[PDB]
Structure formats: structure tokens, C-alpha cells
Design a protein around this motif. Structure first.
Motif, PDB file in Angstrom:
ATOM      1  N   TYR D 164      10.504   9.072  10.264  1.00  0.00           N
ATOM      2  CA  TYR D 164      11.250   7.999  10.914  1.00  0.00           C
ATOM      3  C   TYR D 164      10.497   6.675  10.824  1.00  0.00           C
ATOM      4  O   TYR D 164      11.075   5.634  10.486  1.00  0.00           O
ATOM      5  CB  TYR D 164      11.508   8.373  12.374  1.00  0.00           C
ATOM      6  N   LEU D 165       9.198   6.697  11.122  1.00  0.00           N
ATOM      7  CA  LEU D 165       8.427   5.460  11.111  1.00  0.00           C
ATOM      8  C   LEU D 165       8.195   4.957   9.694  1.00  0.00           C
ATOM      9  O   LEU D 165       8.145   3.744   9.473  1.00  0.00           O
ATOM     10  CB  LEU D 165       7.099   5.665  11.838  1.00  0.00           C
ATOM     11  N   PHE D 166       8.047   5.862   8.723  1.00  0.00           N
ATOM     12  CA  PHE D 166       7.992   5.438   7.329  1.00  0.00           C
ATOM     13  C   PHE D 166       9.310   4.800   6.907  1.00  0.00           C
ATOM     14  O   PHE D 166       9.323   3.797   6.184  1.00  0.00           O
ATOM     15  CB  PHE D 166       7.656   6.627   6.432  1.00  0.00           C
ATOM     16  N   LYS D 168      11.375   3.179   8.879  1.00  0.00           N
ATOM     17  CA  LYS D 168      11.469   1.855   9.491  1.00  0.00           C
ATOM     18  C   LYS D 168      10.524   0.855   8.829  1.00  0.00           C
ATOM     19  O   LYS D 168      10.934  -0.257   8.480  1.00  0.00           O
ATOM     20  CB  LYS D 168      11.188   1.946  10.993  1.00  0.00           C
ATOM     21  N   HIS D 169       9.258   1.227   8.644  1.00  0.00           N
ATOM     22  CA  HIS D 169       8.237   0.263   8.239  1.00  0.00           C
ATOM     23  C   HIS D 169       8.173   0.085   6.724  1.00  0.00           C
ATOM     24  O   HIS D 169       8.369  -1.023   6.217  1.00  0.00           O
ATOM     25  CB  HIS D 169       6.868   0.693   8.780  1.00  0.00           C
ATOM     26  N   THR D 170       7.890   1.162   5.991  1.00  0.00           N
ATOM     27  CA  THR D 170       7.722   1.043   4.545  1.00  0.00           C
ATOM     28  C   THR D 170       9.050   0.759   3.854  1.00  0.00           C
ATOM     29  O   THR D 170       9.143  -0.143   3.014  1.00  0.00           O
ATOM     30  CB  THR D 170       7.091   2.316   3.983  1.00  0.00           C
TER      31      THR D 170
ATOM     32  N   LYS F 168       0.632  -1.503   9.242  1.00  0.00           N
ATOM     33  CA  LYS F 168       1.904  -2.202   9.409  1.00  0.00           C
ATOM     34  C   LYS F 168       1.817  -3.296  10.470  1.00  0.00           C
ATOM     35  O   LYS F 168       2.240  -4.433  10.234  1.00  0.00           O
ATOM     36  CB  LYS F 168       3.014  -1.208   9.754  1.00  0.00           C
ATOM     37  N   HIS F 169       1.268  -2.981  11.643  1.00  0.00           N
ATOM     38  CA  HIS F 169       1.354  -3.886  12.786  1.00  0.00           C
ATOM     39  C   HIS F 169       0.233  -4.923  12.795  1.00  0.00           C
ATOM     40  O   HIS F 169       0.496  -6.128  12.755  1.00  0.00           O
ATOM     41  CB  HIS F 169       1.340  -3.083  14.092  1.00  0.00           C
ATOM     42  N   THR F 170      -1.020  -4.472  12.855  1.00  0.00           N
ATOM     43  CA  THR F 170      -2.134  -5.409  12.956  1.00  0.00           C
ATOM     44  C   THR F 170      -2.328  -6.182  11.658  1.00  0.00           C
ATOM     45  O   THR F 170      -2.457  -7.411  11.669  1.00  0.00           O
ATOM     46  CB  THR F 170      -3.416  -4.664  13.328  1.00  0.00           C
TER      47      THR F 170
HETATM   48 FE    FE Z   1       5.955   1.419  15.228  1.00  0.00          FE
END
Ligand code: FE
Ligand code: ZN
Lengths: 172, 172, 172, 172, 172, 172
Positions: D164-166, D168-170, F168-170
Motif C-alpha cells: 500500500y505504501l509503495f 502511494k509513495h513510489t 520518501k518523507h525526510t
Molecule cells: Fe507514509
């Protein structure tokens, strides 16, 4: 073996690492030239700017080789960046001649790299070299030959105004 | 030897000079075609414009070959640009067929040039040829084949409206 | 006879064809000069640009002559574009002097063409020549005389900085 | 023989047709992956978008190959596009691994195509492959390796938040 | 059963999968037509563009059917996309007639799909079909009938200018 | 002695040369980290970007030290840039810790340089160091401490999602 590695010979990987080191060394030599021309007793601002640009371009070429190595699944093994063969480049003309020799040696290394990639049937490596380094090397070698020719005709280094006016007009 | 010359075989230089002459000859032939179609008794303005554009493109290709020759330290040795094999091209269809034959011959010359550069292990020359001349030759040959096919289907030259409408639509 | 032809003597047609060939030859000579100055061991970029511009202008002059020939109902008969008298122009000053000689010869040819058109009472041909070629020839010859004078005063070619500074200032 | 065909071996034509089929099959497999990730019980919208983009890119690669085949005078002979090896790709990580395997196989096919074009001395075909497919294959394989590495490190598929986070982010 | 599945009969799911395959096959056939018209020896650029647009539209129709399948909780089961019935479409008129036949067969398949969805009392499936596929099929069939009628009246394929002028005017 | 040299002890010159070498080495180490994180089996694009930015900043710091050396009349004497102590940095957390150690060592070298410049009563050198390097070192060391703290709290490297989410974030 890297999950992405495919048709990437180990000795091609080693040659790419060597070329990375050579491009970093060329960047260091160009930085040395820029420093020499930033000296108070040399004071050729456009020579210094030109050689600093060459140093940054060589660093970018090295970074592109590292990116290629990572793309092909090869592992970058950095070596010592040897100091430039001297600190005093003795003239704008001599610095341009040394830069011409350095770019010809880098072009020879890239030509050997392309030969190796052709022998190993690595078409992507050959295309990468010929697309991003061989044309750039030919253009840079031609530009340096032009600079050396103009400086020699102008009478540099003996003609003191020669290097100054080349700095202003060609490099400025 | 030129200070910039590196991995540039003498016969590669000679082949580049021959290709320069061939591109200049192709430019001259296209100029002849354009002139023929600017005739009052031919009066195909878009055929003339197309062939004039081809002539200028051939001249630019020759100029790029000269720039490459100078870049590699080779010396440009210009020869007589032979007159085109005919002055009256006899039709838009016949002119397009002759242009197709000329582009095929120029592509064959470029292919032999690339073969020589490969045999001489001149990767920069091979890359220059394949990047700036081989793709252009394939595209031009395909375009000329399309033009010839369309003119043949439309009934040119016997169908006198065929050439006029091709001039207006395809070339206009 | 062409449907558009009137008051266009056949010998005027032949003279126009000869002038077309001469303008193409002048374009070729200027291209040769530009190539020579693009050499690594000459490296006068503005000399090369100036002579390339002259070459393109000569090609445009030939194109305009061919347009005139088609306009008058004459038939363009292209001949071999002879190779330039040399490949090594040996200096910016020498190249400018050779360009001056070439433009003087082209102006002499145009003057003979105007004399012929006057003899055959071809007022349109005379007006075309005097409007598009005689003024241009006089301007170009004056500019080349100025260039040669400035190079000679500067000390070219013995004074190596002379050609470089003329390249930067006058031609740059 | 096609009027435009020149230096285009018949077996190169057959290899190009096979590569057409392989690129269409890769597009179909990517479409299957996108469909799987658009499922309600998978519901990875960015995985689906990424694989749909890959499918469209593969279709464009096939389209460019057929344009090349027509450009070279070869005849496109389309074959059945085989169904993807499965419909349930069972995870984002597994789908990325299968995509990596598919792109490696497509790159191997393109490498064999380049080898054949080199053996047949088809410099234009070699240049086309290396310019438009080999670099793209290396970049895509590196990107897929990066995706697989990140998913494995994140703990996918066992760690359900990893995919899920991959997504969203990647991929988002 | 899928958590989202509701009033979605199994045989409706199978019919949707079959329609997905049929739309992919229609896309492949249109791609074949576009390739045929990109050939040097037929060279109808606007016919090729029209059929490539039809191919992409068919692919989009298939993708929309896949999206519907996933929306309704059905599972997409892709099958082999059969090769088009032929590679040489023999004319613009013949290609348009074959496209008309293909779109009429696709419309018949969609009509049977709507009949099944009505028998299964699946109002959402019926609405989706009639909103996104039936109107599109009727419009496409009418457009193809218009194209075939215009080509037949123009005298295609015997009238060689017929297909060229239809390519320019109707399809350009 | 340089005409511009004033209140610039030889020890300060040597210490500036050593600091130039140390900044170049730090740039090289950061380049190594960036390359490691560009690896397919690491694939932390924002870690790679962060460390590449650090490498370029270190190179700029070295260039500024060279500019200072030339400004003060000292002579730049470049030495070999030793290879980074490792090629595999084995983690985002480990790379950040090594970067923290490197910046702490560089800050210690700069502190010794400032101590020397204070002992030699070189107020301009002290001001240059404290204005362009000490504040930057403190800020960079604090940022690296923050990064290391966040990675450790997140559970890196054992928590494989920790490094990805920090990327991703920092760093993104
Ligand atoms: Fe996150
Ligand atoms: Zn449809």
C-alpha cells in the motif's frame, strides 16, 4: 549477480570503473588548471572559468558513468583520484595543450571501452559510450585544438597580450 | 598529423571526402529537379519546393560531413560536383523515382562508409553516420517510396491531373 | 519555344546558364574557405562563418538566376561545378584576397552579361542584373576590400594576433 | 522486393516481426497486471496505473517496430498475441518481479535482434534498436529492480502496509 | 465471491471476458490495417492514421470492459488475441469494408451481451453497454458505411486517385 | 612571495591545502554513498540525491577553499583524493552515521584550522572559516544527527520500511 544485470560482462564493469576513475582524475586536473588561472600571478579569469567548467563537466561524465554502472547491475568500485601531474600549468597555452592531451587520453580510454563493449557484444554499453562520451570527446578535443591553435598563432605565451586577449575574446 | 586527430583512419578520411562530394552532387541533382519543376511548361510549384528543400538538406548533410572531417582532424579535399545526369526530369513521377534512386545510392554510400568505419574501429564515425545520416536516409527513402507509390496509383504521368493533385495535396 | 519567352535571346539564355554555373562555383569556393577556417589548425570560427554565409549567398544568387531563367522561358542547363582552385587557403588575409578576386571575376561576368543583355535589347534582363547582382557585387567587393585592407594594416598573416582580432571584431 | 528496401536482410525482417509479437505480448501482460491490480480484492490503483502505462509503452514499442519494418521495406506479419502466463499476479511484489522478468526477456530478444543486425551489417537497424529500445529496456529493468528491491525491503507481500505504501509513495 | 459482486451473473462475466477479447482482436485488426497503409507500396498516411485511431479506440473499449469487469466483482480472464485474418488488406476500400464487417460483428457481440444482461436482469450491465458501446458501434458503423460508399462511388480501388483523394479529404 | 600575500602564514597555507584535500575527500565519500544508494539492490533515490547534494556541497567547499588560498596569495598544492573507506555503505542508517562521522571529522579539521589561524593572528582566515565553514558544519552535523536519530527510532535498518519512508518523507 544483480537482479538487473543482463549482457554486462564483468570486465566491462571493471572498464567502466576505470573510466569513472579517469573522468574523476580529468575533473581534478581541470580543477587544478582553474586554480592555477585563479592565481594572483596568473589572473586569467576566463581561463579559470573555462577549466572549472571542464572540471564540472568531467565530474558529470563520471557521475553518468556511475549511473550507467548502477543501471547495468555493475558495482562501482572507486579508487584514489591521483593528484594532477603538476600544480603550475605555466601558461594558458600550456594548460590548453595539457587539457588537449588529457582529453585525447580520455578519448582513447573511451575508445578502448567501446572496443571492449563491442567484443563482449554489449550493444547498450556501446551505444551509451558513443552517444554520451565519444561525441563529447571529439567536440572537446576539437575545441581544445582550436584554442591551442589560436593561442599559438597569437604568440602565446611569449606574447603577453596573446593570452589576455584570448581570455577576453575566446573564453569570455 | 592534426593535433586533434585520434582513431581516424586515412581511408575513413578519404571516404568522408567522397561522401561530401556525393552529398553535394545529390544537392545539385535536387536543385536541377527543382529548376525543372519551376519551368513554365512543367509548373509544379510544390514539386519544385520539395526538391529545393531536398537540395538544401543535401547541402546541409555535406556541410555536416565537412564539420565532422574538421572535427576529426581530417582535411576536406573537395572535388568537382558533377552535373546531374539529366536536365529534363520528364515528370513529377520520374523525378520522384530518380530522387528515390539517388537517395538509395547515397544510403548505399553511407552504408559502405559505416562498414569502413566499423572495420577501422572508429566508433565515433560509426555513431555520427548512424545518428545523422542513416536514419535520415531511411526516412527520406521511405518518403520518396511513398511519393512514387502515390503518383503511380494516381496515374502519373499519363493522368495529368494526378501530378497536379499530388503537388497540391502531398507536397503542398 | 517556351510559351512565356519573348525578347529573350538564346545567347542571353546561355550567358545566364554560364552565370548560374559561375555563382555555384563561387558558392563552392566560399564553402571551401569556410571549411579551411573550420580546421583545427586554423580555427577562425568567424572567418568560417563569414565564408559560409558568402557560400550560401552565392547559392542564393545562382537560385535567383535559375528562377530568372525559368521566368524568361529559358532552359537551365547545369554544368559541372569545378573544384575550388585550392583547399588550403593558407590565411585569413589570403582567403579574403581570393574572395575579393572571385567576387571581382563574378562582377566581371555579370558586367559582360549586362552588356550582352543591352546588346540584345533585353531591358528586363538588364534591370534584373543591375537590381539583384551588380549592386550586391559592388557592395561585396567593397566589403572584401575593406577586410583585406584591415588585415593588411593589422599585419596579417605575419602578425598572428591580427587574424584572430579581425575574426573577433570585424567578423564577430 | 520493396522499392525502399536496402541492406535489410529477410531474417532481420523476421526477427523484427518476432519482436513486434513480443512487444505486443509484453503490452498484453502489463494490461493483465493492471487489470489484476484494479480488482476490488487487490485495489492498488497506482500499481494498476503503472502497469497500464507499461502496457501502453509496450504497445508504442510495437508500433515503432512496425513503423521501422515499413520504413525498411519489410512486411509486417502479425501473429497471435499469446495470453499472459497467468491472470492472478498475487501481489505487487510478484507482479513487479514478473514485470522485471518480462523486461529482461524482452531486452534479451532485443539484444539478439541487435546481434543479428550486426551480423547482417545493418547499421540503421542496429542504431534504431540501440537508440529506441536498448536504453529504454535498461532504464525499465533498472526501475523494476528498484521497485522489487523496495518492495522486498518493505516486507511485501507479507507486510500488507508495504504494498500500500509503495503504491502511494513510489507509484503515486 | 467478490465483496463488490451483486446482481452480476457468472455467464455475464464470461460474456464480458469474451467481449474484452473481441475488442482486443478488433484493436489488433485495426493495427494491422494501419500497418498495411503505412507500407511504402500503398502509402496512405491518413488511412493508416484512421485505422491506428480505430485500433487505439478498440483497445480503450477493451480497457473499459476490463474496468467494468473489475467494478462488478468479475474476474478478467484474458485469452489469446488471434492474429488478424490477413496482413495485406489490398486497398483502402477493402480495408474500410473489412473494418465495417468487423465493427458489425463487434456490434452483434455487444447486442448479444446486452440481450444476456437483459435476460439476467442486470440493468447496470445493460446501461453500461448501451451507453458506452452500442451508440459508439452505431456511429462507427455509420462512419464506415459512409467511407465505403464514398470510396465505391469515387471508383476505388480501380480509380487510383479515388483512394488518394479520400485519404486527403475525408481522412485528412 | 605572492604580491597579494599579507599576514598569511605558511602554516595557514599548508592547513588550507590539507582542508582542500579533506573537503575533496568528503565530496568523494558522499559521491560513493550516492552511488551506493543508486544501486538496484538498494534503490533509495532520495538517499542517493541527498548524498549527491552533499558531495557537490563538499566540492563547492573545497573550491571555496581554493579561491581563498588564491585570494591570500597562497599556492594550492593538490594531493591524491583517497578512495572512500568503503564501497558498500550497507544501509541508509549506516550511511547517515558515516556521513555524521565524516562531517564531525571535517568540522574538527576546520576547528584546528581556525585554531591555527588564531595562533598566527590571521583574522581574515578565521573570519572566512567561521563564516563559510563552521556554521555550515554545525548545521550539517545537526541535520545528520537528526537523520540518524529518526532512522534509529523508525527501526532502521532492521525495519525495512523505515529507510523507505525516511527516503520518501525526510529526504523526499
Ligand atoms: Fe507514509
Ligand atoms: Zn468497441
Amino acid at each position: 549477480p544483480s537482479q538487473v544485470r543482463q549482457n554486462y560482462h564483468q570486465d566491462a564493469e571493471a572498464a567502466i570503473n576505470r573510466q569513472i576513475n579517469l573522468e574523476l582524475y580529468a575533473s581534478y586536473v581541470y580543477l587544478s588548471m582553474s586554480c592555477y588561472f585563479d592565481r594572483d600571478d596568473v589572473a586569467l579569469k576566463n581561463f579559470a572559468k573555462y577549466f572549472l567548467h571542464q572540471s564540472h563537466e568531467e565530474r558529470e561524465h563520471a557521475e553518468k558513468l556511475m549511473k550507467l554502472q548502477n543501471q547495468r547491475g555493475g558495482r562501482i568500485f572507486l579508487q584514489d583520484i591521483k593528484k594532477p601531474d603538476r600544480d603550475d600549468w605555466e601558461s594558458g597555452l600550456n594548460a590548453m595543450e595539457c587539457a588537449l592531451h588529457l582529453e585525447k587520453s580520455v578519448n582513447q580510454s573511451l575508445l578502448e571501452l567501446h572496443k571492449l563493449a563491442t567484443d563482449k557484444n554489449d550493444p547498450h554499453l556501446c551505444d551509451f559510450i558513443e552517444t554520451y562520451y565519444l561525441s563529447e570527446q571529439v567536440k572537446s578535443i576539437k575545441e581544445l585544438g582550436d584554442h591551442v591553435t589560436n593561442l599559438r598563432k597569437m604568440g602565446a605565451p611569449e606574447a603577453g597580450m596573446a593570452e589576455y586577449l584570448f581570455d577576453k575574446h575566446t573564453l569570455g
